[PDB]
RNA sequence: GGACCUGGCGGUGCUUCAUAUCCCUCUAGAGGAGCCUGUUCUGUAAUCGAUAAACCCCGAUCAACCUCACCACCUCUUGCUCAGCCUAUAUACCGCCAUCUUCAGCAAACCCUGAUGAAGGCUACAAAGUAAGCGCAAGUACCCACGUAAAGACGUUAGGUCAAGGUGUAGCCCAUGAGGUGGCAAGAAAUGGGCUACAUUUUCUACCCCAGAAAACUACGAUAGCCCUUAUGAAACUUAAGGGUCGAAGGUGGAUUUAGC
C-alpha cells in the first residue's frame, strides 16, 4: 500500500536501533552494525528506469534555440546510464573505503603516545599551533550510581609542549572519549611549566626524586645519547625538547604519579647560572673530548668570592647502589643496553 | 582531637543562634554532622542554667520550695521557644500548682538568663509537663466525673575487559561563493 | 474547593449586626472594618437566619440522610419531633396536676437533653507504645462526644431488631427513653465508660 | 511518558522548527492547523475523503520535491479550489521549480478533479526555532 | 514593596532571593529612622501602590412601571 | 592481601513527615448470596497478546457468519501487489505508552579543591562555584486569579506492544503463502471486577414530594431458568427487547481490603 510507507528518516531510525535498552547501557555490542546510508545522494530529479528525457527537469529545456520535446532513451543508451550509476556507486564506496591510516602509539591498541594535534584556538584569537599534544593514559572509569547502576566514563591524561621548554599536562574527564581529549589538551596549555635545558638538549644535572610511591632517577647525558627512558618519559621529553637523557622508573609505575613527579623534578633543576650566583664562584666544565681545557659555563653576576670552596676530603653524599654496581661492572642484566630504535 | 571529629574548617566562625538568622539562613544548606553538636551542646547549657536557677532559694522562694526537677530541655532549632520539660508529680493537684508557679516564674526567668550574658539571646521559655503522669491526670479527672450508670549460568564478562574498537576506527582512517542575479 | 483561600465563611446572625457601635471594643471594631474588604462565601442552602433554626437538629438530620435524600431525612426528623410532642401531650393530659409540672412537652428540649445524656465523656483509642496497639482510655473532645451521641442514636434505630417499625416511631421512643436516662444508647455510654475504667492500668500505653 | 509528536531534549545541537518544537497539546493554543477545510465542522460531510486526500498530497509533494521542502505543507480548500502552500529551499534551479509546479498542479488537478494551485515560498535555509 | 521580578528590572540584573530580602530589610531599617524628604522620594521608588477593588455591592437602579 | 571510594543492603540510629493519608478517626463499599463479565485451571481437533505494584469489562468505544489471526477437510501456485508470510526475535527497533510522577530534578560548556587519586564543589553578618537548555513554574482550556484538566524532563523496570502500521536480523516460497465449507470457544473448580439484592429512610400505584395500599412461605428478592412473541440479520435453542411462567439463594457478610476533602 502507498499509504503504509514511511520516510527515510523513520526507516533508518528504526533499522539502526540507536535508541533503546540496547544502546542505553551498551547492552548490545556491534561487530556487525547497520550503517546509515543516504540513498538520495546520487539521485537526480527526473531520472527514472524508463529513461524519459523531461525538458527542463533532467535535460536542458532549450536545444539549438528551440524548446526540446519529450523523448526517451533507447534501451541500449539506458543500460549504459544504469551501469554508469552502479559504477559511480562502487566508486563512491571505494572513496569511503580509502581512509588515511594514522600512526599508532606505544602499541597498536594503545592510546598512549598518539598525537592529538595543537590545542584549540582560544576565544580571544589565541592560538597554540606551536604546541603538540600527546596522550599518556586513557582509562575507562566505572561509577556505581544510585538509580542507574554502573555507568562508564573516561579519564584521559594528556601532555602538551612546544619543544622549546614549555610543557604541561592535564587530566580530562567526560562520558565521551573525544570530549575528554578536548578538555585535557585545552586545560593543559593553561598550566604550562617551563623546563630548563642544558644546551637545549639535556637536563642540567642528575635528578633523583620520589613522588608518592613512584621513584624517578634521571641522568644528564651528552649529545647523541638519545632518550633511553620509560616510554611515557620519552613522549614527555619530546614535548619539552630534551634530546639526551637516561631515566629509570622504579616503585609504583602510575602514569599520573610519573607525569607529575617528572614535571616536579624537571621544574626544580638548578641551572649553572643559579649555582654560580648562589656560591659566587665560577662554574667550570671539564670535558674529556676537549682534554684539560677549562670551559667556564657560568660566572656570578655579583662579586666573585676570593676564598676557595672547602675541599672535603670525602663527601657525605648518598649514593645509588645501582649506579655503583654498574660502575664496578657487578651490574649484569640481559635487558640493559639492548639495541633499540632511535628515540 | 578525639574519635569524635573536631577539625572543622570554619571552627573559628562565631556561632550565632538567633531567630533572625533562621529567616536569613539558606534552607537549601544541609546541616553538617557537627552542626547538630553545636545545637546539642547549647541545649545542655540551657538545661544546666535552668536546673541551677531552680535550686537556688533567692531567685524565687516559691520556686525553691517546690523542688522542681526538669526531665529534659530541648531548644527548638527554629529558635522560637526553649522547650523545658518538667517531670510531673504523681499528686494530681500538685501538678497544677507546680505548673502555675512555673508559668508565672517563666517570664522573670528569661530576664534572669540575660544576667548570664553568654546565654542572653534566649527565646521565650516554655514549660511542658511530662505526660507520663500528666496525661493520666486528665483522664482520672474525667473518670470520676463520668457516669458509669447503675452499677451491678550464562557467562558474564568483566566490564573492564570489554573490548572496544574506538581506537581501531580512529587509527584505521582519518575520518571523512559569489552570488549574482540571473545567473546563466 | 472552588473558593480561593481568600474567601471567608459567612456569618449568619442578625443580632451580631444590629449590635450598637458603642458596645463594640477596639478589637471587635477592627474585625468589622476588616470584613468590609474580604471576600465572603455564598451562604449554604442548609442554614438560614430563621428564628426556628437549630444547628444540632440540622446536623442530626444530615447524619440520617441516605444518598443525598435530604427531603426524606428532613421528613423523618419533623415526624420524630411531632411524635415526641404527641406522646408528651398524651402523658400530660393523663397525669395529675402535680405530675403535670414535671412533664416536658417541648420536643427540642427533649431532643437536646436526650443526646446530652448519651454523650460519652471518655473513649477508647489505640495509642501505640512498644510495638503494639493498646486501647487506651483517652479523654474525648467536645466535638467527638456530640458526634458519638448522634451516631449511636441513629445506629440503634437502624438496627434490625426493630421489625417493621417506622423510623419516626423508633427514634421518638429512643429519644424519650434517653431523655429519662434509660435505653440501649444510654447503656452504650455506660459500658464505654466501664470499659475505660477497666483499662485505666493501660493509660501508660 | 508521553511520546506523540515530541522532539525530545538532546545536547543542544538539534535544530527544530516552530511546528516541530510544539507538542500536540499546544495545537490551537500556540500552533495552528496544517490543513483548513469544512469537513470537521459540525453538520459537515466528507471528512474521511478530505483526510485521505491530505495524506496523499503530503507524500506526493515530499517525493515530488525531494530534498526541497523546508517545512510541512499548509493545505487550504476554498470552494472547489485546492491551494498548496510550501516553504522550499533555494538549491534547485528556478527552471526545475517551474517544471515541478506546472507538472504538480496539472497532475493533481486531473487526479482530484479540481483546480489546484501550488504556492512556493523559498528560504535560504531551514528556519530554526530553537536548538533542543 | 516591589517584588523581586520588579527589582530585577529596575536594576537590569538577576538577583537571588536572599539578595532581595537583604535589600528590603535595609529599606525597612530606613523608614524606622527619621528620614527626611530626600530620603523619602528614594524609598517610594521601591514602593508599588496596591490598587484594591472595592467589595461594596453595586446597587441596581430603581425603575418605575406603567 | 592492605587502605580507601561508590553502590546495594542492614531483624540499621536519630529526626521530621505523608492530608483521602502509613495507623486511628469520617462516609459508602468489596470480602458471604444470585447474576453479569475477565482471568486461571480443567476440557476441546480448535488462536494470540496482557498477566506484582504498573494484568485480570486489559488490546475489544465489543467475536452468531464475517470479524479471524485458530481447528478439520478440500482447492490454487508469478499468486489483490515489479508477490506474499498475524513465521521467530519487543533481549535489534521506529511508532505509541505504562511506571515512580499524589516527583523536582536532569544538564552541555567552563571554573576550582583533593599533591592534578577513585572523588568533591554549601554556609547570606556567606567559606568556589557560574551555568545555556529541558522539566517544574508561568501561560493556556473549562465557569475566575479557585478547582479540574492538560502538562510532567532525565532516569528506573532489556516494563508493554513485531498481532495497529512500518521495519533490522533469521526463516517459509507446491507453503510457515492464498481461497472455500464446516466447526471451536464448555465448566469439576478457583479467583478479580461489576450489577441486583437481602427490605420499612422499604415495596406497588397516582403524583413528581401534604395520597392510598402492600408488608414473611401469594412479602422483599433474578437483568437467572423455562415457554412464547417481536426487533436486526441471508442465517438467532443462541443476540437484544417484551410478555408469560417460575418465586430460588439471600435476612446486611470473618481475616482482610477499596475509594473519597
Ligand atoms: K553505604
Ligand atoms: K459485601
Ligand atoms: K519500544
Ligand atoms: K509491528
Ligand atoms: K519483524
Ligand atoms: K464482587
Ligand atoms: Mg595490532
Ligand atoms: Mg499518562
Ligand atoms: Mg461476592
Ligand atoms: Mg487468554
Ligand atoms: Mg503470555
Ligand atoms: Mg510478552
Ligand atoms: Mg509487572
Ligand atoms: Mg469461516
Ligand atoms: Mg468465527
Ligand atoms: Mg498465516
Ligand atoms: Mg521492552
Ligand atoms: Mg490555575
Ligand atoms: Mg492528567
Ligand atoms: Mg505545568
Ligand atoms: Mg521484556
Ligand atoms: Mg497456510
Ligand atoms: Mg426474566
Ligand atoms: Mg426474522
Ligand atoms: Mg413475590
From Swiss-Prot, chain A:
Keywords: Mitochondrion, Ribonucleoprotein, Ribosomal protein. GO terms for biological process: mitochondrial translation; translation. Residues 131-195 form the S5 DRBM domain. It is found in: Mitochondrion. The keyword Ribonucleoprotein applies. GO terms for molecular function: RNA binding; structural constituent of ribosome. The gene is MRPS5. It comes from Homo sapiens (Human). Belongs to the universal ribosomal protein uS5 family. GO terms for cellular component: mitochondrial inner membrane; mitochondrial small ribosomal subunit; mitochondrion. It comes from the Eukaryota. This is Small ribosomal subunit protein uS5m. Component of the mitochondrial small ribosomal subunit (mt-SSU). Mature mammalian 55S mitochondrial ribosomes consist of a small (28S) and a large (39S) subunit. The 28S small subunit contains a 12S ribosomal RNA (12S mt-rRNA) and 30 different proteins. The 39S large subunit contains a 16S rRNA (16S mt-rRNA), a copy of mitochondrial valine transfer RNA (mt-tRNA(Val)), which plays an integral structural role, and 52 different proteins.
Swiss-Prot record, chain B:
It comes from the Eukaryota. This is Putative ribosome-binding factor A, mitochondrial. GO terms for cellular component: mitochondrion. GO terms for biological process: rRNA processing. Signal peptide: none annotated. Keywords: Mitochondrion, rRNA processing, Transit peptide. The keyword Mitochondrion applies. The keyword Transit peptide applies. Belongs to the RbfA family. It is found in: Mitochondrion.
From Swiss-Prot, chain D:
Keywords: Mitochondrion, Ribonucleoprotein, Ribosomal protein, Transit peptide. GO terms for molecular function: RNA binding; structural constituent of ribosome. It is found in: Mitochondrion. It comes from the Eukaryota. Its main location: mitochondrion. The keyword Ribosomal protein applies. GO terms for biological process: mitochondrial translation. Component of the mitochondrial small ribosomal subunit (mt-SSU). Mature mammalian 55S mitochondrial ribosomes consist of a small (28S) and a large (39S) subunit. The 28S small subunit contains a 12S ribosomal RNA (12S mt-rRNA) and 30 different proteins. The 39S large subunit contains a 16S rRNA (16S mt-rRNA), a copy of mitochondrial valine transfer RNA (mt-tRNA(Val)), which plays an integral structural role, and 52 different proteins. Belongs to the universal ribosomal protein uS3 family. This is Small ribosomal subunit protein uS3m. It comes from Homo sapiens. The lineage of its organism: Eukaryota, Metazoa, Chordata, Craniata, Vertebrata. The gene is MRPS24. The chain holds residues 36 to 167 of 167 of the full protein.
UniProtKB/Swiss-Prot annotation, chain E:
It is found in: Mitochondrion. Belongs to the universal ribosomal protein uS9 family. Component of the mitochondrial small ribosomal subunit (mt-SSU). Mature mammalian 55S mitochondrial ribosomes consist of a small (28S) and a large (39S) subunit. The 28S small subunit contains a 12S ribosomal RNA (12S mt-rRNA) and 30 different proteins. The 39S large subunit contains a 16S rRNA (16S mt-rRNA), a copy of mitochondrial valine transfer RNA (mt-tRNA(Val)), which plays an integral structural role, and 52 different proteins. This is Small ribosomal subunit protein uS9m. It comes from Homo sapiens (Human). The gene is MRPS9. The chain holds residues 199 to 264 of 396 of the full protein.
Amino acid at each position: 500500500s502507498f499509504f503504509t510507507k514511511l520516510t527515510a528518516d523513520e526507516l533508518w531510525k528504526g533499522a539502526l536501533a540507536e535508541t533503546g535498552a540496547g544502546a542505553k547501557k551498551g547492552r548490545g555490542k556491534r561487530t556487525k552494525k547497520k550503517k546509515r546510508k543516504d540513498l538520495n545522494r546520487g539521485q537526480i530529479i527526473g531520472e527514472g528506469r524508463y529513461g524519459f528525457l523531461w525538458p527542463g527537469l533532467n535535460v536542458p529545456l532549450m536545444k539549438n534555440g528551440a524548446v526540446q520535446t519529450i523523448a526517451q532513451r533507447s534501451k541500449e543508451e539506458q543500460e549504459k546510464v544504469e551501469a554508469d550509476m552502479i559504477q559511480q556507486r562502487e566508486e563512491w564506496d571505494r572513496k569511503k573505503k580509502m581512509k588515511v591510516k594514522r600512526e599508532r602509539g606505544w602499541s597498536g591498541n594503545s592510546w598512549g603516545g598518539i598525537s592529538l594535534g595543537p590545542p584549540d584556538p582560544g576565544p580571544c584569537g589565541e592560538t597554540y599551533e606551536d604546541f603538540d599534544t600527546r596522550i599518556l593514559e586513557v582509562r575507562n572509569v566505572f561509577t556505581m550510581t544510585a538509580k542507574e547502576g554502573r555507568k562508564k566514563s573516561i579519564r584521559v591524561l594528556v601532555a602538551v609542549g612546544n619543544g622549546k621548554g614549555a610543557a604541561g599536562f592535564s587530566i580530562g574527564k567526560a562520558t565521551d572519549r573525544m570530549d575528554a581529549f578536548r578538555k585535557a589538551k585545552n586545560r593543559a596549555v593553561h598550566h604550562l611549566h617551563y623546563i630548563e635545558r642544558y644546551e637545549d638538549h639535556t637536563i642540567f644535572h642528575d635528578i633523583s626524586l620520589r613522588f608518592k610511591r613512584t621513584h624517578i632517577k634521571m641522568k644528564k647525558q651528552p649529545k647523541g645519547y638519545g632518550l633511553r627512558c620509560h616510554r611515557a618519559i620519552i613522549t614527555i621529553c619530546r614535548l619539552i625538547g630534551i634530546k639526551d637523557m637516561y631515566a629509570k622508573v622504579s616503585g609504583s609505575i602510575n602514569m599520573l604519579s610519573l607525569t607529575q613527579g617528572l614535571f616536579r623534578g624537571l621544574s626544580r633543576q638548578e641551572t649553572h647560572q643559579q649555582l654560580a650566583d648562589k656560591k659566587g664562584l665560577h662554574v667550570v666544565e671539564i670535558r674529556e673530548e676537549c682534554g684539560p681545557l677549562p670551559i667556564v659555563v657560568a660566572s656570578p653576576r655579583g662579586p666573585l668570592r676570593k676564598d676557595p670552596e672547602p675541599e672535603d676530603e670525602v663527601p657525605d653524599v648518598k649514593l645509588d647502589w645501582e649506579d655503583v654496581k654498574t660502575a664496578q661492572g657487578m651490574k649484569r642484566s640481559v635487558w640493559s643496553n639492548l639495541k633499540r630504535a632511535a628515540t | 582531637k578525639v574519635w569524635y571529629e573536631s577539625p572543622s574548617l570554619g571552627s573559628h566562625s562565631t556561632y550565632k543562634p538567633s531567630k533572625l538568622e533562621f529567616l536569613m539562613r539558606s534552607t537549601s544548606k544541609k546541616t553538617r554532622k557537627e552542626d547538630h553538636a553545636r545545637l546539642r551542646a547549647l541545649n545542655g547549657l540551657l538545661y544546666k542554667a535552668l536546673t541551677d536557677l531552680l535550686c537556688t532559694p533567692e531567685v524565687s522562694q516559691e520556686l525553691y520550695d517546690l523542688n522542681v526537677e526538669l526531665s529534659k530541655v530541648s531548644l527548638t532549632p527554629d529558635f522560637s521557644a526553649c522547650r523545658a520539660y518538667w517531670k510531673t508529680t504523681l499528686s494530681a493537684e500538685q501538678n497544677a500548682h507546680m505548673e502555675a508557679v512555673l508559668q508565672r516564674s517563666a517570664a522573670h526567668m528569661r530576664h534572669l538568663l540575660m544576667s548570664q550574658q553568654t546565654l542572653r539571646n534566649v527565646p521565650p521559655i516554655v514549660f511542658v509537663q511530662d505526660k507520663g503522669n500528666a496525661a493520666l491526670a486528665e483522664l482520672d479527672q474525667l473518670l470520676a466525673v463520668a457516669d458509669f450508670g447503675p452499677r451491678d549460568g550464562r557467562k558474564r564478562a568483566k566490564p573492564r575487559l570489554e573490548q572496544d574498537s574506538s581506537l581501531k576506527s580512529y587509527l584505521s582512517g582519518e575520518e571523512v561563493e559569489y552570488e549574482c542575479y540571473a545567473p546563466d | 474547593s472552588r473558593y480561593s483561600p481568600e474567601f471567608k465563611d459567612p456569618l449568619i446572625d442578625k443580632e451580631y449586626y444590629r449590635k450598637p457601635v458603642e458596645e463594640l471594643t477596639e478589637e471587635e471594631k477592627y474585625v468589622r472594618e476588616l470584613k468590609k474588604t474580604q471576600l465572603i462565601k455564598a451562604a449554604p442552602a442548609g442554614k438560614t437566619s430563621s428564628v426556628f433554626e437549630d444547628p444540632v437538629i440540622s446536623k442530626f438530620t444530615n447524619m440520617m440522610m441516605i444518598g443525598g435524600n435530604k427531603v426524606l431525612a428532613r421528613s423523618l426528623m419533623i415526624q420524630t419531633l411531632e411524635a415526641v410532642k404527641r406522646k408528651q401531650f398524651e402523658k400530660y393530659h393523663a397525669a395529675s396536676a402535680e405530675e403535670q409540672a414535671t412533664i416536658e412537652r417541648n420536643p427540642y428540649t427533649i431532643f437536646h437533653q436526650a443526646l446530652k445524656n448519651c454523650e460519652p465523656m471518655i473513649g477508647l483509642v489505640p495509642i501505640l507504645k512498644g510495638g503494639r496497639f493498646y486501647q487506651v482510655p483517652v479523654p474525648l473532645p467536645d466535638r467527638r462526644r456530640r458526634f458519638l451521641a448522634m451516631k449511636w442514636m441513629i445506629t440503634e434505630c437502624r438496627d434490625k431488631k426493630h421489625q417493621r417499625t417506622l423510623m419516626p416511631e423508633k427514634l421518638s421512643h429512643k429519644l424519650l427513653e434517653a431523655f429519662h436516662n434509660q435505653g440501649p444508647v444510654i447503656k452504650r455510654k455506660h459500658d464505654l465508660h466501664k470499659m475505660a475504667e477497666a483499662n485505666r492500668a493501660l493509660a501508660h500505653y | 511518558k508521553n511520546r506523540a509528536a515530541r522532539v525530545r531534549v538532546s545536547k543542544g545541537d538539534k535544530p527544530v522548527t516552530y511546528e516541530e518544537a510544539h507538542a500536540p497539546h499546544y495545537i490551537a493554543h500556540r500552533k495552528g492547523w496544517l490543513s483548513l477545510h469544512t469537513g470537521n465542522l459540525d453538520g459537515e460531510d466528507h471528512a474521511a475523503e478530505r483526510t485521505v486526500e491530505d495524506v496523499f498530497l503530503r507524500k506526493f509533494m515530499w517525493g515530488t520535491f525531494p530534498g526541497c521542502l523546508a517545512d510541512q505543507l499548509v493545505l487550504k480548500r476554498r470552494g472547489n479550489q485546492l491551494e498548496i502552500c510550501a516553504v522550499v529551499l533555494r538549491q534547485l534551479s528556478p527552471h526545475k521549480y517551474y517544471f515541478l509546479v506546472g507538472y504538480s498542479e496539472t497532475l493533481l488537478s486531473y487526479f482530484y478533479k479540481c483546480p489546484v494551485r501550488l504556492h512556493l515560498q523559498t528560504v535560504p535555509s531551514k528556519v530554526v526555532y530553537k536548538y533542543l | 514593596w516591589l517584588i523581586k521580578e520588579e527589582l530585577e528590572e529596575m536594576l537590569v540584573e538577576k538577583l537571588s532571593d536572599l539578595d532581595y530580602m537583604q535589600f528590603i530589610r535595609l529599606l525597612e531599617k530606613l523608614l524606622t529612622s527619621q528620614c527626611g524628604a530626600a530620603e523619602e522620594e528614594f524609598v517610594q521608588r521601591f514602593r508599588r501602590s496596591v490598587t484594591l477593588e472595592s467589595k461594596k455591592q453595586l446597587i441596581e437602579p430603581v425603575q418605575y412601571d406603567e
